[PDB]
Amino acid sequence: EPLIRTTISDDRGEEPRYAGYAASELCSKGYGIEDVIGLLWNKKLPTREESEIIKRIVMISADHGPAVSGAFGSILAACAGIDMPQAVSAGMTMIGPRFGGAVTNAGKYFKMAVEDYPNDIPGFLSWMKKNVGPVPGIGHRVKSVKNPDQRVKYLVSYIKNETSLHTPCLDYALEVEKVTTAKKGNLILNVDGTIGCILMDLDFPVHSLNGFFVLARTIGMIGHWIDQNNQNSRLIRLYDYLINYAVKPEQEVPEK
Amino acid sequence: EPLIRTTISDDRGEEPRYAGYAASELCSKGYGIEDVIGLLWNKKLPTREESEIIKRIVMISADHGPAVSGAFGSILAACAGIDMPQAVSAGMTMIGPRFGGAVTNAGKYFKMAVEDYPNDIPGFLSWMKKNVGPVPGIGHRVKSVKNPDQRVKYLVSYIKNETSLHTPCLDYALEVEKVTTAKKGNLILNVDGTIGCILMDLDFPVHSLNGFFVLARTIGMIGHWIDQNNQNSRLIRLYDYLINYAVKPEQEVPEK
Amino acid sequence: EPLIRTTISDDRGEEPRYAGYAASELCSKGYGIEDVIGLLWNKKLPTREESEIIKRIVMISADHGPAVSGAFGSILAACAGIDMPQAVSAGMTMIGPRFGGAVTNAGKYFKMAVEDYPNDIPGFLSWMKKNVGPVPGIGHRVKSVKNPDQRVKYLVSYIKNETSLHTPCLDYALEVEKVTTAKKGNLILNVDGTIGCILMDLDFPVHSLNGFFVLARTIGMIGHWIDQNNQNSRLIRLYDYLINYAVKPEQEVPEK
Amino acid sequence: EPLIRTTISDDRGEEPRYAGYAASELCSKGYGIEDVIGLLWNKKLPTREESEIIKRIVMISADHGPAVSGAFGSILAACAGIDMPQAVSAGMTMIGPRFGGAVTNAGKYFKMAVEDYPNDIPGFLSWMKKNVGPVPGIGHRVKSVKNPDQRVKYLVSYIKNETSLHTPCLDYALEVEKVTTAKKGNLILNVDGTIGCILMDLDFPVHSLNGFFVLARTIGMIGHWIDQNNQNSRLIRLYDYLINYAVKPEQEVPEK
Predict the structure, then answer these.
(1) Option in B16, B89, B208 nearest A93 (CB)
(2) How far apart are CA C217 and CA C222, in angstroms?
C-alpha cells in the first residue's frame, strides 16, 4: 500500500520526466522555465503565446522592493544570520490574504462576473459591495489614474497587441476599472487583479493561481537575502519610538 | 536613521527597477526569467550564452520526484490541508547540507582545486580525503558510469558544444570524475557538483550559489502541492511497521 | 507614527513585564510556565484551578509519537541536517485543519451547541451533518469505547473531581459522546474535542485556542529533533514501493 | 526496513509514554511542564532542584518585547493575516546565531574555559579574542553594571541560594564578568551566557541547549500573534524614510 500518489514528475529514469517530457529534451528543443512551470503545475505544455505571457507575469512580479512583507521577512532573517533557504521560507510564509492572496480572489470574482453578470457591471458591483466588500484586484495605496502601474499597463498592452488570446476575465476587469476609477482615482485594476484575470484566461485552475506570486517573489527574496549578506548587514532591532507599548498597569505579583 | 539599506530593487517609480533596469523594458526587449535572476542576485545582466546556461540549470533542477526531502515536505503539508505558500515554505526549509547544499561545497572545493592544485589531481584528492572526507559533487546512490545522470551529461554537452564559455572548475571536476569512477563506478560527477562548478565558472559568488536550487525546486514543490490538492489527498500517517520504537522501559512515576 | 502597537509585554525595564507582572517576581512567588502562558495569551493571571488545568492540557498534549505530521516534519528536517529552530518551524507549519486545528472547531461548534441547541442533541447533529460535515472533536482512527483515550479520560476526571469549574461545552460534548458511541464504537470524544471544550469553558479567547497545541507539540518536536541528532540519523528517502507513480505516458517533446 | 528510529515517545498505548512514563500519571503525581521537557529532551525525569531551574529558565525567557526578531517576525505574519502556527513558524525561523544562538556558544566556550583554562581567565580571554571574537554570553546593548539585567541577577541568586547544584561553568562566567565589567560597564554576563552555563552545569546534552530558547520564545510569539489579532492590526509596510535605497543608476535596457 503506497504512502503517496504522484502524477506530475518521474525521477526513476536517466533524468526526470515532467508531465511525460524529458527535462533535457525540453532544453534541447528551446523551451524555457515558463514551459516547465506549465508542465509541473498544469500538466500541459503552454502554447507559444501562453508561454510569452507566463514569462512576463514572472518577470513583472519578481520583486517590489524591501518594504513589503515577503522581502522584509527574508531581510529580517538575513540580518539575524539565517541561511538563505530558511530566510526565504520565512518571507514566503507571509504570502496570504494581505500579501499576494488577492490574485486568487480577483480571479475567482472576475470569473463569476463573466459567468453571472456578463452584460451587467452595476449588478456585479452591487453584489460585490453586499457580499464581499471592496472588489479584489481593484484599488491601490499610491497607484492611480494619475500615477499608473506600468506593470499593469505593460501586461495588458502585451496580451492585447502581441497575442491573439481571448481574455474575458481581464476584459471584464478593464470595463469595471473604467467605472471604479470614475468613482475614485485610486480604484485602478491593480497588479493582483490583472494577473488573477490573465491566469483564469490562460485556463489555470483556481488553486494553482497562487503559484505565480510564490515562485516570482522567491526570485526577489533570494536577491534580498544575497544583498543583505553582501553588505554584512547587522541584526535588525525595531527602534523604540516605532513601538506603541499600550501595556497593562505594572502590578505586584499576589501571594498564592 | 534608516532601518534597512537595499541595493537591488527600486519600487518607488511607475514599476520596479531591477539593478537599474525597468521590469517592462526587460520584457519588451525579449529578456527572460533567467535574466531577472542574474539582475536580482548578481546585479548584472547575463550575456546571451550565460542566460542560456542559467535557463537550463533551472529547467534541469525544477524537480526530482516526490521521495526527496523538499518535495516530500511540501506533500506532507499539502496532505495536512496547509495552504500552498506555507506548504512550500516547509519543503524549502529542508534545503541544507544533505538536500541541495553540496552545490555550494562542490563550487568551493573545485574552485580551490583550480587555484591550489592546477596540475595536481592526486594532491587535491589526498588533501580532500584528509581534510573534508568524500569530495562534494562526487558520488550518487544509483547513478553511475553504467547508469548515467542525463541531467549532468546534457548540461556538460550544452556548455561545451553550444557556448564559448571557459569553464575551469567544471573542466577540473570532469578530470577528477575520470579518476574517481576508475576507483568505483558510482563516483560520478553528480548534478550538485556539475551545477556548483558551472555557477563558479559563470562568476556567481559562493553565497549566491544556493539560490539556483532554492528557486528551481520551488517550481517542483508548488507542482507537488497542486497535484496533492487536485487528487484531494488524505492526511499522511507513517505506517506503524515503518517506525522502530526503540523506546525506554515503561516505568511507574515515582512519588514526589 | 509607531509601526506596531503591543499590549502584552514590556521589555524596557530591568526585566520583562508580562501583562504587567515582573517575570522574576512570578518565579519568586512560586508561579509556573502555565501562569506565564495565561498572562501572555489572555492578559490574566490564572486562578489556581485554571493554572492546574492549563498545566495538564500542555503535559497531555506534548507529543503523540513520530508518525504524526508535526513530529514527522521535524524528523525529516533533522535527518536532512537542518538546525533545531528551522526543523521545528517546518513541523509547526503542519498545524492546521487536519493536524491540531479541530481543537478550535470543536470549541466553536460545542459553544454553538450550548447556545443554540441546549436540550437538542438531534438538532445539533442534524445541523452539523448538513452545514459542516463530521462533528469536530468526535471520532478516532483507533481509540474507541473498547480502547479508550486515557488522555481524555484523565482530563475529564480531573476537571470534574478536582476542580469546581463549570464546564457547559465539555458537558454537552460528553452527552453527544453517549449518543455517537451508541451508533459506532469509534465515535468517541477525542482529545481535540476535550481540550477545545475545556478551553471554551475556561473563557479563553477564540483566537488563543490553537496556542495550546502549537506550544505543547513544540516540546515534542524539539525532543524529536534532539533524538534524531543524538542517533546521527541518516537522510530520509521515501522507499520506491511507498510511492504510486501515476504519471503521464512518456512522450517526445514537439518542435516549437 | 523501518524508515525512522525513535527513542523518546511511544503513542501506541492508551496514552503516550514520554521516556517510559505515562503522561496522565505524571499529571496525577504532581509533575509539571518542566518535567515533560526533561523527559522528552534528555530522557530523564529531573530532580526537584533541576525541575525548579528548568521552570525558571522557561518563565524568564518567555518573551522580551515586540522589537526582537522572533516576536517581530510573528507580528509581521499576524499583520499579513497568516494563521497562528505558520506565523509563529516564521518567527521561530529567526532563531540562530544573532537571536538566541549565543546560549549554545556560551555553554560550549565556558565549558572549554573550565576544562582548559581553570585558573587562567587571561588565557581564556586571549584565546577567545584570537579564535572566536567577542565572548558569547558577555555584553549587552543597554544592560550594564549601572542597569543590571534582573533576569540574570534572579537566576544566579536562585541557583546559588535555593539549590545545592554545583555550577562550575556559571561560576567561571561570573569570574569573567568581574574582569570584563571592570574594563567596560556594558560587558556583563548576559541572559544567554547565564542560561547556557546553567544548562551545561545541569548536564543537558549540547544538542538540547537551543530547545530552551525555542520553547520559551514560542510562548511569547503565540502571545504576540493573539495580541495583533485581538487588535485587528493592519498590514505592516516599512515607512519609506526607514529604507535607504542605495540602488544602481537608472539605465535603458540594451538590445539583445
Answers:
(1) B89
(2) 9
Positive or negative, the Cα torsion across D77, D83, D84, D85? Answer: negative
Look up residue A150 and give its three cell numbers. Answer: 506600468
How many residues make up chain D in this entry?
256
Strand-pairing partners, residue A189, are: A138
Q: Which residues share a beta bridge with B6? A: D245
Structure method: X-ray
Q: Which amino acid is at B174?
A: L
CA separation for the pair C107, C103 (Å, rounded): 6
Q: Cα(B214)–Cα(D208) distance, rounded to whole angstroms?
A: 28
Instruction: List CB contacts (< 8 A) between B99 and chain C.
Output: 80-81, 235
- For C77, the closest of B77, B80, B94 (CB atoms) is B94
**Which of B76, B142, B244 to mutate against chain C (most C CBs within 10 Å)?**
B76
Resolution of this entry in Å?
Answer: 1.7
Q: What angle do CA D201, D202, D203 make, to 5 degrees?
A: 85
Give the CA-trace dihedral at A11, A13, A17, A22, to 10 degrees: 140
3-state SS string over chain A? CCCEEECCEECCCCCCEECCEEHHHHHHCCCCHHHHHHHHHHCCCCCHHHHHHHHHHHHHHCCCCCCCHHHHHHHHHHHCCCCHHHHHHHHHCCCECCCECHHHHHHHHHHHHHHHCCCCHHHHHHHHHHHCCCCCCECCCCCCCCCCCHHHHHHHHHHHHCCCCCCHHHHHHHHHHHHHHHHCCCCCECHHHHHHHHHHHCCCCHHHCHHHHHHHHHHHHHHHHHHHHHCCCCCCCCCHHHEEECCCCCCCCCCC
B30 assigned ligand-binding residue? no
Q: Which residues pair with A18 in a beta bridge?
A: A9, A21
In terms of Cβ atoms closer than 10 Å to its own Cβ (0-12, 13-18, 19+), residue D178 is exposed
Given an 8 Å threshold on Cβ–Cβ distance, is A245 in contact with C12? yes
Contact D204, D41 (CB under 8 A): yes
Q: Which range of residues forms the domain containing residue A154?
A: 101-208
Amino acid at B172: Y
Confirm or deny that C251 is annotated as ligand binding: yes
Closest residue by Cα to residue C173 from C164, C155, C131, C130: C155
CA distances from B154 to A15, B64, B177 (A): 10, 16, 16
Task: State which amino acid sits at residue D67.
Answer: A
Backbone angles phi, psi at A217, to 5 degrees: -70, -20
Q: Is D56 left (phi over 0), alpha (psi -120 to 50) or beta?
A: alpha
Assigned C-alpha cell, B250: 515503561
A3 phi and psi, to 5 degrees? Answer: -80, -35
CA dist C156 and C147 (Å) reads 16
* B120–chain A nearest CA distance, Å: 32
**Which helix (H) or strand (E) is C9 found in, with range?**
strand C9-10
The DSSP symbol for B59 reads: H
Vertex C148 angle, CA C142 and C149, to 5°: 80
Alpha helices in chain C (DSSP H): 23-28, 33-42, 48-61, 69-79, 84-92, 102-116, 121-131, 150-162, 168-183, 191-201, 209-230
Residues linked to residue B21 through DSSP beta bridges, in sequence order: B18
Q: Which residue has the cell 558577555?
A: D138
Q: What is the least distance, in Å, from the CA of B70 to any CA of chain C?
A: 9
C87 CB neighbours in chain B (<8 A) are: 93
**Grid coordinates of C212:** 495550546
> What three-state secondary structure class fits B158?
helix
- CA–CA dist C201, C204 (Å, integer): 8
Angle, CA D70 vertex, CA D64 and CA D76 arms, to 5°: 115
- CA angle B197/B202/B203 to nearest 5° reads 100
CA distance A180 to B238: 52
Task: Answer for the pair D110, A93: CB distance below 8 angstroms, yes or no.
Answer: no
Which residues, other chains included, contact B155 with Cβ-Cβ below 8 Å and sequence gap of 6+? B56, B57, B60, B191, B194, B195, B198
- Shortest CB distance from C6 goes to which of A21, A29, A243? A243
